[PDB]
Amino acid sequence: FREPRRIVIHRGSTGLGFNIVGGEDGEGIFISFILAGGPADLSGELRKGDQILSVNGVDLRNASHEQAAIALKNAGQTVTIIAQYKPEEYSRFEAKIHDLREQLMNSFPPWVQQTRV
Amino acid sequence: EFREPRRIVIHRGSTGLGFNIVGGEDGEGIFISFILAGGPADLSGELRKGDQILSVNGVDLRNASHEQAAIALKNAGQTVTIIAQYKPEEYSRFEAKIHDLREQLMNGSFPPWVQQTRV
């Protein structure tokens, strides 16, 4: 439905200012957390639930969570990214975790792989 | 096979100079995309679809960014000088890539997330 949206952003004393998840097997790379007010919310062109398709033209469509990671701290000086906002597919994740989570104990649990950047 | 650049003599009009530009990422280069028909660049018929813009007012653009070009086109003023060169091959492979990834992503012109300036 949605068209991807190109964004560029310059790191802070924080860094890029969002948390990443996904793409260790059959998933893909997604924005878990927009920090309040940092180099995300000040722009605000991103939200939790955009998948990150590109980082300076390297393709994260199929990328691995640590490839996604080497790329996006390596990303750089500044980094042309494209976000495809995909709400329906990111809830198809967050709840599976929560349901997974309610099942084994009889926001995100630490055993859910997520990488700060 | 590479072909002979040309020095192009064109002047600004109305709203526009008659086209827009693509490129500047990955050090690739700057290319026009389309030329607004009935516009100075179209009206002059010395510019076509799929050049690289090598220099404008002697500013070397080969390895340059997109917005530097975008302004060099908005920026120079009123008569401007362009060495352009025709590579429809590398522009197709360019567009074909883009066209080919759109439906991969979602499922003639280019989607909003790629820079193009109308100039």
- Mention every residue, 6+ apart, whose C-beta is less than 8 A from residue A5: A45, A82, A83, A84, A85, B112, B113
Contact status of A77 with chain B (Cβ, < 8 Å): no
CB neighbourhood size of A110 (10 A): 6
Closest by alpha carbon to A19, among A80, A92, A94? Answer: A94
For residue A56, list chain B residues with Cβ-Cβ distance below 8 A. Answer: 25
Contact status of A88 with chain B (Cβ, < 8 Å): no
Nominal resolution in Å?
A: 2.9
Contact present, A47 and A34 (Cβ < 8 Å)? yes
The reply to whether residue A80 touches residue B25, judged by beta carbons under 8 angstroms, is yes
Contact status of B105 with chain A (Cβ, < 8 Å): yes
HSE (side-chain half, CA atoms, 13 Å) at A24: 8
Instruction: Calculate how close chain B gets to A76, using CA atoms only, in Å.
Output: 14
Q: What is the DSSP letter of B26?
A: B
The reply to whether residue A6 touches residue B114, judged by beta carbons under 8 angstroms, is yes
B57: left (phi over 0), alpha (psi -120 to 50) or beta: left
CATH topology of domain A1-117: Pdz3 Domain (2.30.42)
Distance of alpha carbon B33 from alpha carbon A35, whole angstroms: 38
Q: What is the DSSP letter of B24?
A: B
Contact present, B7 and B82 (Cβ < 8 Å)? yes
Which CATH entry fits the domain spanning B1-119: 2.30.42.10, 3.40.630.30, 3.40.47.10, 3.20.20.80? 2.30.42.10
The reply to whether residue A5 touches residue B115, judged by beta carbons under 8 angstroms, is no
Contact status of B112 with chain A (Cβ, < 8 Å): yes
Closest by alpha carbon to A80, among B47, B118, B66? Answer: B66
Type of residue at B34: F
